[PDB]
Amino acid sequence: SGFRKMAFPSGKVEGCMVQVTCGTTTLNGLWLDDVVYCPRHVICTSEDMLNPNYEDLLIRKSNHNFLVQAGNVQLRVIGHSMQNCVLKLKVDTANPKTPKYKFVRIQPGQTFSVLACYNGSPSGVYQCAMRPNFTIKGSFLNGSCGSVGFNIDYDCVSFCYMHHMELPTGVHAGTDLEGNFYGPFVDRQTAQAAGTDTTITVNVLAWLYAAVINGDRWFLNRFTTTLNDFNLVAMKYNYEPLTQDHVDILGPLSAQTGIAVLDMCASLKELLQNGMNGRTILGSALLEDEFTPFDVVRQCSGVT
Amino acid sequence: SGFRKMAFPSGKVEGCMVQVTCGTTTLNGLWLDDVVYCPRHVICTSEDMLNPNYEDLLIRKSNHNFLVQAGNVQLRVIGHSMQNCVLKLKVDTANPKTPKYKFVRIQPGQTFSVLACYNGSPSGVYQCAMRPNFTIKGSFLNGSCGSVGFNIDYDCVSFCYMHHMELPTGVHAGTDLEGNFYGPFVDRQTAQAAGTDTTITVNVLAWLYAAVINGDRWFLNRFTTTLNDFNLVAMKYNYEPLTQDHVDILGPLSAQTGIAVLDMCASLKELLQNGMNGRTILGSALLEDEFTPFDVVRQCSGVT
Numbered sequence: 001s002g003f004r005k006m007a008f009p010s011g012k013v014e015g016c017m018v019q020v021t022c023g024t025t026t027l028n029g030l031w032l033d034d035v036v037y038c039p040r041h042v043i044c045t046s047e048d049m050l051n052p053n054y055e056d057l058l059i060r061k062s063n064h065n066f067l068v069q070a071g072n073v074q075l076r077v078i079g080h081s082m083q084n085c086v087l088k089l090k091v092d093t094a095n096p097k098t099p100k101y102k103f104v105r106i107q108p109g110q111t112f113s114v115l116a117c118y119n120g121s122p123s124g125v126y127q128c129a130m131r132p133n134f135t136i137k138g139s140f141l142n143g144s145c146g147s148v149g150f151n152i153d154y155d156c157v158s159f160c161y162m163h164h165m166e167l168p169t170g171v172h173a174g175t176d177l178e179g180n181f182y183g184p185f186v187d188r189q190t191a192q193a194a195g196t197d198t199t200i201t202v203n204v205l206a207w208l209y210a211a212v213i214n215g216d217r218w219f220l221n222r223f224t225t226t227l228n229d230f231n232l233v234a235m236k237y238n239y240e241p242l243t244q245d246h247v248d249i250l251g252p253l254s255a256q257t258g259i260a261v262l263d264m265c266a267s268l269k270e271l272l273q274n275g276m277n278g279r280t281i282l283g284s285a286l287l288e289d290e291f292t293p294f295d296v297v298r299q300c301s302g303v304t
Numbered sequence: 305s306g307f308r309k310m311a312f313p314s315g316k317v318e319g320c321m322v323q324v325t326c327g328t329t330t331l332n333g334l335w336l337d338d339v340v341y342c343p344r345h346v347i348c349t350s351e352d353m354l355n356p357n358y359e360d361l362l363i364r365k366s367n368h369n370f371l372v373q374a375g376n377v378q379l380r381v382i383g384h385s386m387q388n389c390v391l392k393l394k395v396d397t398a399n400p401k402t403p404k405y406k407f408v409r410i411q412p413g414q415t416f417s418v419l420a421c422y423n424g425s426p427s428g429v430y431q432c433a434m435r436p437n438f439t440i441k442g443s444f445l446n447g448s449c450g451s452v453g454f455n456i457d458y459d460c461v462s463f464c465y466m467h468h469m470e471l472p473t474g475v476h477a478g479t480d481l482e483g484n485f486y487g488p489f490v491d492r493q494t495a496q497a498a499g500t501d502t503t504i505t506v507n508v509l510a511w512l513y514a515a516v517i518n519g520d521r522w523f524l525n526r527f528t529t530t531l532n533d534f535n536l537v538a539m540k541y542n543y544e545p546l547t548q549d550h551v552d553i554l555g556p557l558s559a560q561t562g563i564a565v566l567d568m569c570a571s572l573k574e575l576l577q578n579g580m581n582g583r584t585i586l587g588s589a590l591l592e593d594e595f596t597p598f599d600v601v602r603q604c605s606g607v608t
């Protein structure tokens with residue numbers, strides 16, 4: 001028993017991290033097969049970031065201008081191309097530590113592990129959720145760009161995020177591995193509105209099921225609700241509307257605990273309307289939304 | 305910016321994990337050089353765990369009874385010995401993935417990463433603190449025994465914990481890598497009192513400094529206090545007494561932010577006496593104590 005904000009083991013991803021330098025800028029790259037992926041803003045200087053013309057900036061660059069180093073060994077760059085906001089540097093050597101991998105675009109509300117890196121070296125790993133507004137609340141300092149987010153299913157790493165920037169509000173924005181930003185964000189040093197965020201309702205319910213499985217039950221009540229009634233409360237408290245697809249994904253947790261999804265919704269409704277009254281759930285004094293129903297089942301079953 | 309409960313990258317530890325089977329029991333082992341370390345309770349059966357005679361149980365076992373498998377390859381056991389509550393199985397092959405390592409006994413209040421494993425396979429990584437009462441609030445299910453805790457300083461892994469059991473209260477107990485339990489715990493299936501736990505005051509203060517560095521400042525007030533006055537409040541709220549050694553370790557964070565340690569103590573005093581009033585600090589609605597002053601500096605500076 002016990003419940004933790006668990007990240008995937010980062011080993012398979014550590015073996016892919018490289019340092020990429022272009023001029024005076026150094027950031028992180030991901031070396032998979034004979035390609036290194038990194039944010040295209042590695043080609044920018046301070047004067048450029050306000051509104052860089054990436055096509056023009058990249059034209060002044062040659063294969064030899066991109067310095068790629070994997071630990072202490074230098075990789076030979078034989079090609080370069082820009083795909084959306086990522087640069088793909090073709091190298092003459094396939095990464096011998098390349099795991100089985102996929103590039104996936106995750107949905108808002110889904111979770112993933114981030115391996116924060118500096119100068120191509122891993123510093124730490126933490127579990128994140130892609131906010132409904134497509135930002136992530138990470139921990140990234142100068143030099144962290146090119147750090148990636150991923151999920152792991154047995155031996156396959158599904159890369160879903162590459163870190164590009166911190167918005168003036170202190171939240172983080174990045175792209176999928178094809179360089180498409182999550183959300184409306186552009187890779188420019190400008191004020192960018194991130195939409196209204198909401199709490200991931202299906203994840204809070206999954207976390208309430210994790211609480212019951214692990215022994216924290218004080219919040220269970222004698223009430224039930226309907227999807228319509230619950231959604232009126234979800235609206236008032238900036239929670240995502242619950243759909244039948246969300247109820248269906250909560251099926252296994254409802255079956256395991258014997259607590260019907262709408263009964264758990266009624267517990268969540270009471271917690272939203274009355275707060276915690278100074279109590280905690282799974283060591284938290286707020287409603288946790290960065291655990292999906294899949295995460296809860298995985299952690300509660302011990303999937304390796 | 306941003307602050308997360310970050311774990312160390314687990315790669316160096318994943319390459320050491322093995323499965324150890326003895327009879328019908330399977331758990332995790334740590335393969336370093338030509339030795340595999342695992343909890344000695346791998347030799348027990350259900351009837352034994354109420355009060356096992358480990359010396360007698362181990363005498364009925366031979367090198368060939370310990371099945372050690374690293375992924376898909378079987379290791380040949382050429383020796384076995386019990387040191388405190390750990391078994392050391394000598395194997396004929398040194399682990400080629402053995403990183404630089406140390407065995408350390410951490411102090412209560414210190415933090416470490418845990419790589420939860422099942423059947424010798426890593427499932428996840430999370431950051432823990434050794435509670436003042438020598439328990440850890442982990443996430444471990446059946447089969448997790450032998451999972452380890454560690455810290456990493458550049459290329460050196462300092463192994464500090466090996467998981468042995470879950471107490472009837474749902475908290476976790478384990479040993480250092482020499483098999484000495486942290487706390488009063490014994491490896492028996494019996495009710496075991498874990499002492500009164502307290503909140504790690506120096507860690508809460510370090511986390512308040514992390515909050516100021518990252519922009520959450522609402523809790524800063526116009527007051528100051530003394531170590532004596534603060535400790536009277538710490539006593540009332542089951543917080544560890546603050547010492548000058550704790551103030552000294554907070555020095556770098558006090559210097560970076562310009563907020564004197566006793567002024568931060570006065571903010572903490574007001575938060576203990578008045579609560580959060582429905583606000584959050586670094587995404588938490590409670591006072592966080594699982595970040596040491598070293599962790600805060602490391603995460604705020606980007607040490608890899």
Ligand SMILES: COc1ccccc1OCCNC(=O)C1=CC=NC(=O)C1
Pocket residue numbers: 041049140141142143144145164165166167172186187188189190305
């Ligand atoms: C506004 O900056 C940008 C806009 C578009 C593109 C790149 C930008 O930044 C490049 C350098 N940024 C960093 O190294 C970070 C510093 C702190 N926190 C982070 O998450 C990243």
Ligand SMILES: COc1ccccc1OCCNC(=O)C1=CC=NC(=O)C1
Pocket residue numbers: 001345353444445446447448449468469470471476490491492493494
């Ligand atoms: C009371 O059990 C023991 C006492 C002494 C020694 C060993 C004991 O357990 C062996 C198996 N335990 C597990 O696999 C766990 C199940 C669930 N949670 C965990 O943290 C471990």
